[PDB]
Amino acid sequence: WTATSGSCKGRCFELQEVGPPDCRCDNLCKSYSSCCHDFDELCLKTARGWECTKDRCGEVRNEENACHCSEDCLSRGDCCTNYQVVCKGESHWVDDDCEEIKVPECPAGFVRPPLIIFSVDGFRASYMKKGSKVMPNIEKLRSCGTHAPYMRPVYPTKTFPNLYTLATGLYPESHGIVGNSMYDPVFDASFHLRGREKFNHRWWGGQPLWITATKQGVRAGTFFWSVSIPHERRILTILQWLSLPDNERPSVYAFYSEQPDFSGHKYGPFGPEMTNPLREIDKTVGQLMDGLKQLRLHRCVNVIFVGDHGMEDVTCDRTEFLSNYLTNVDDITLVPGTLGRIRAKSINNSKYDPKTIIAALTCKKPDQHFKPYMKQHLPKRLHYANNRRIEDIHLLVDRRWHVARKPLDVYKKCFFQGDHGFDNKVNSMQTVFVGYGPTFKYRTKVPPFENIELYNVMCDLLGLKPAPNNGTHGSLNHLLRTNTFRPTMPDEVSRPNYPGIMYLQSEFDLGCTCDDKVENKLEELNKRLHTKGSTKERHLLYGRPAVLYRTSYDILYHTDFESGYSEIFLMPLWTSYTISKQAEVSSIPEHLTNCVRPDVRVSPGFSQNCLAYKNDKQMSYGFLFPPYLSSSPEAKYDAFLVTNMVPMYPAFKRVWAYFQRVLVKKYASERNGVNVISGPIFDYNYDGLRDTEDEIKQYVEGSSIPVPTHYYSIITSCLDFTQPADKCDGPLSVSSFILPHRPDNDESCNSSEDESKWVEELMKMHTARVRDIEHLTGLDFYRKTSRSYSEILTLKTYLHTYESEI
């Protein structure tokens, strides 16, 4: 109930929330069906439209009018945004040359540059170039301020997950808004775009920027707008708030536009109908900047122009139907469209089986346009598993397509030409970022980055301490003239042991054999020097990784590679090696096919054993430093040490062997050498974070050898590829992956073919940031370079996407 009989007089667009049942006068009262009886009359005036005309200049004030052109309007803060242009001879902001804003130029009483976030739904990144001719205000922001060529949304590339990620810095699995539609099995409640459940605060996790600001005494404008409030009124309300007395005035403001998404769904991303929505958004930017100019705030405010996601061409005819795969289609509930999520229709049905559903959906039709995954097997870069609202079965749908349960859902539940939601590396899903104002840089292009990083920067712009989030604070310092956040590298928690030769061969009873016993003064000294680290500068290029948790581990040096060997997990945490452009690939010699060698620096008790692999009929092993890339026949023996061995399913060894034997040398040829760091990952609870020893669900049969969920590699070279990776003077270039360690290659429909036709495709799908590997391993990389720390933070957030040019 709401007592709608109260009044909005003197309260229009009031900032504090009045609790039930008193009626409301704020931005969102319409959405809550709670506005006072007189809200439209007093607060949504429309008389005489939105623009001054020559004949209104100097007019006697009529409070009925939507905005004013009377001589008192500037003191009242309610002029039409074009007032000074029409009545006072001024220029539109867009017509002024851009001039660097070196310092804020703010009116007296302003404690900090205000932040205005101007958000656009469905604004695909390529609109900034493709629509530039019809968006002069936006083009001026972009060209004169700081801009990225695009900004990467979060998965799923839907509106509410992305808007809330912008506001919180968190992945959807952490903030809880994992889709526009959700079922939470603990609440037994459904969240939808339609209806009241979505208003319950229990859905909304983390801490959004307006709450961060408020808790730290920085006032925020009301954070969002009821859809029926016209854009012109939203801009006028923001400008009105900016004229409040100092003690009452917000420091952070948000505008949101439902366009171009609304038309893009109807017309497709480049429908000819799309020009007009782009012009109308540009005109709204122009109203804002003109309004700011009138208030003398156009060289004071920081403006962020940012979108939530792009828009792809999708039509009704490109729909896959689960009814063409499943016999039991009425026993499941599907959340449909550009992603699929499947769960049992009834919790009382004991004949629901997820394995049979996945199997029936796997590589069943030649051009099949979706792929099923259990959620833990989704690419780790999606960070889309650790929430009870994310169903165990997920369908990744190809761009341009939909999935639905049955055909009747598509015509009795056609018209649309655009949609979004797909994998957040897809080019059509990328969106926009421009920052303009005194705290942003001038005429500066920055590389693409992810929208999870912006919350920290918005906090930086407001002088706020961010709530804990998934950005990497400092990684976006290059967007900023001032207010940078200067992080310190985390402290190493565990220091390594450096074992020498401590064990004789016969102390080992590992069940391993090797044909290595065929036989000096200076030659033996030389190999003693390798074991003490004499080649470590060549193979450990950026320092050893720091271990940021408590554990017991050994550094092991070799001619061709260096490792940090865990005494607890019985394998390396990391193995580091450099491969020059000139390196040569060799075979594993016949007499060494099954060679595994005890490591006389590591006790039998802290070693793997070969008998466990013999007896585990599902599990084989591989090596982290590749035997194929040994520098000499003699150095090759080091690659068969038991301290370089890791458990690998035979299906995964197909993938791993091709990467090691073919791809590493390809990357070294293309990049002028590469440095590789490889290792295992254990994430059995799919939380994106390193497992402790007691979270491990699978061991090599009969042993304490834990089985990795994933294997990673970080592949670094010189950004200026005229310098070899091992003699690089400047910025670095990286690409990395986190490959699922699976017992089959059912993900790869073409896996019966030669690895050359499918392995690299698999690897590209599981591309990763160095930071993702950091979270999964408790390691900290790039500790010793000549590069600034914020630059290394940006390198660690880089994702190699393999999409062609935007």
Ligand X SMILES: *[C@@H]1O[C@H](CO)[C@@H](O[C@@H]2O[C@H](CO)[C@@H](O[C@@H]3O[C@H](CO[C@H]4O[C@H](CO)[C@@H](O)[C@H](O[C@H]5O[C@H](CO)[C@@H](O)[C@H](O)[C@@H]5O[C@H]5O[C@H](CO)[C@@H](O)[C@H](O)[C@@H]5O)[C@@H]4O)[C@@H](O)[C@H](O[C@H]4O[C@H](CO)[C@@H](O)[C@H](O)[C@@H]4O[C@H]4O[C@H](CO)[C@@H](O)[C@H](O)[C@@H]4O)[C@@H]3O)[C@H](O)[C@H]2NC(C)=O)[C@H](O)[C@H]1NC(C)=O
Ligand Y SMILES: Cc1cc(C)c(C(C)(C)CCOC(=O)C(C)(C)C)c(O)c1
Buried b (16+ CB within 10 A) or exposed e, 613-644: beebeebbbbbbbbbbbbbeeebbbbbbbbbb
78 touches Na ion by CB under 5 A: no
616 touches Na ion by CB under 5 A: yes
220 touches ligand Y by CB under 6 A: yes
Residue 480: both structure tokens together: 């900023």
Which among 310, 329, 313 is positioned nearest to 321, based on CA atoms?
A: 329
159 is in an annotated binding site: yes
Q: Which of 173, 320, 423, 691 binds Ca ion (CB under 5 A)?
A: 691
Tell me how far, at minimum, the Cβ of 471 lies from Na ion, in Å.
37
Residue nearest ligand X, CB atom distance? 205
Distances (CA, A) of 173 to 81, 169, 570, 598: 41, 12, 32, 44
Partners of 166 in the beta sheet? none
687 is in an annotated binding site: yes
780 touches ligand X by CB under 6 A: no
Nearer to Zn ion, 143 or 180 (CB): 180
Nearer to Ca ion, 418 or 708 (CB): 708
Nearer to ligand Y, 256 or 416 (CB): 256
| Edge-first strand listing for the sheet containing 332-335 | 332-335, 339-344, 393-397, 370-374
How many residues of this chain interact with Ca ion, rule: CB under 5 A? 5
Instruction: Identify the H or E element spanning 6.
Output: none
Site string (731-760) toward Na ion, x via CB under 5 A = --------------x--x--x---------
Nearer to Ca ion, 146 or 709 (CB): 709
191 touches ligand Y by CB under 6 A: no
How many residues of this chain interact with ligand X, rule: CB under 6 A? 19
Tell me how far, at minimum, the Cβ of 207 lies from ligand X, in Å.
8
Residue 174 binding partner per list Na ion, ligand Y, ligand X, none, with a CB distance cut-off of 5 to 8 Å that depends on partner kind? ligand X
Q: Which of 254, 288, 732, 776 binds ligand Y (CB under 6 A)?
A: 254
433 touches ligand Y by CB under 6 A: no
Tell me how far, at minimum, the Cβ of 496 lies from ligand Y, in Å.
43
224 touches ligand Y by CB under 6 A: yes
Distance CA 503, CA 505 (A): 7
Distance CA 126, CA 549 (A): 43
Residue 250: both structure tokens together: 């917000």
Q: Are 396 and 337 in contact (CB under 8 A)?
A: no
Site string (184-223) toward ligand X, x via CB under 6 A = ---------------------xx-----------------
Q: Which of 685, 698, 703, 723 binds Ca ion (CB under 5 A)?
A: 685
Which among 241, 262, 265 is positioned nearest to 253, based on CA atoms?
A: 241
Distance CA 140, CA 412 (A): 46
Residues 129-188 that bind ligand Y (CB under 6 A): 160, 163-164, 166-167
What phi-psi label fits residue 137: left (phi over 0), alpha (psi between -120 and 50 degrees) or beta? alpha
613 touches Na ion by CB under 5 A: yes
Tell me how far, at minimum, the Cβ of 658 lies from ligand X, in Å.
29
409 is in an annotated binding site: no
235 touches ligand Y by CB under 6 A: no
Residue 685 binding partner per list Zn ion, ligand Y, Ca ion, none, with a CB distance cut-off of 5 to 8 Å that depends on partner kind? Ca ion
Residue 150 binding partner per list ligand X, ligand Y, Zn ion, none, with a CB distance cut-off of 5 to 8 Å that depends on partner kind? none
Distance CA 339, CA 220 (A): 35
Catalytic member of 146, 159, 237, 535: 159
683 touches Ca ion by CB under 5 A: yes
Residue 453: both structure tokens together: 């990083």
Kindly report the number of other CB atoms within 10 A of residue 722's CB atom: 7
Distance CA 278, CA 271 (A): 12
Residue 252 binding partner per list ligand Y, Zn ion, Na ion, none, with a CB distance cut-off of 5 to 8 Å that depends on partner kind? ligand Y
Distance CA 496, CA 117 (A): 47
Nearer to ligand X, 176 or 647 (CB): 176
Q: Coil, helix or strand for 179? A: coil
261 touches Zn ion by CB under 5 A: yes
- Which part of the chain contacts ligand X (CB under 6 A), choosing from 95-103, 240-248, 670-678, 686-694? 686-694
| 63 burial type by CB count under 10 A (0-12 exposed, 13-18 middle, 19+ buried) | exposed
- Which part of the chain contacts ligand X (CB under 6 A), choosing from 402-410, 466-474, 623-631, 659-667? 466-474
558 is in an annotated binding site: no
Kindly report the number of other CB atoms within 10 A of residue 580's CB atom: 17
Q: Coil, helix or strand for 554? A: strand
Tell me how far, at minimum, the Cβ of 467 lies from ligand X, in Å.
8
Distances (CA, A) of 294 to 90, 137, 243, 606: 9, 16, 11, 73
| Edge-first strand listing for the sheet containing 732-740 | 553-557, 562-566, 571-579, 674-681, 710-718, 732-740, 767-768
Q: Are 340 and 334 in contact (CB under 8 A)?
A: yes
Q: Coil, helix or strand for 176? A: coil
Tell me how far, at minimum, the Cβ of 479 lies from ligand Y, in Å.
16
692 is in an annotated binding site: no
- Which part of the chain contacts ligand X (CB under 6 A), choosing from 165-173, 254-262, 394-402, 512-520? 165-173
Distance CA 196, CA 203 (A): 12
Residue nearest ligand Y, CB atom distance? 254
Tell me how far, at minimum, the Cβ of 800 lies from Ca ion, in Å.
24
| 701 burial type by CB count under 10 A (0-12 exposed, 13-18 middle, 19+ buried) | middle
Q: Coil, helix or strand for 652? A: helix
223 touches ligand Y by CB under 6 A: yes
Whether 159 is a known active-site residue: answer yes
Residue 392: both structure tokens together: 């165990």
Q: Which residues bind ligand Y (CB under 6 A)?
A: 117, 119, 160, 163-164, 166-167, 208-210, 220, 223-224, 252, 254, 256
Q: Which residues bind ligand X (CB under 6 A)?
A: 170-171, 173-176, 205-206, 383, 386-388, 468-470, 687-689, 775
Binding site: which residues? 121, 159, 180, 261, 265, 308-309, 420, 683, 685, 687, 689, 691
Q: Which residues are catalytic?
A: 159
Binding site for Ca(2+): which residues? 683, 685, 687, 689, 691
Q: Which residues bind Ca ion (CB under 5 A)?
A: 683, 685, 687, 689, 691
Binding site for Zn(2+): which residues? 121, 159, 261, 265, 308-309, 420
Q: Which residues bind Zn ion (CB under 5 A)?
A: 261
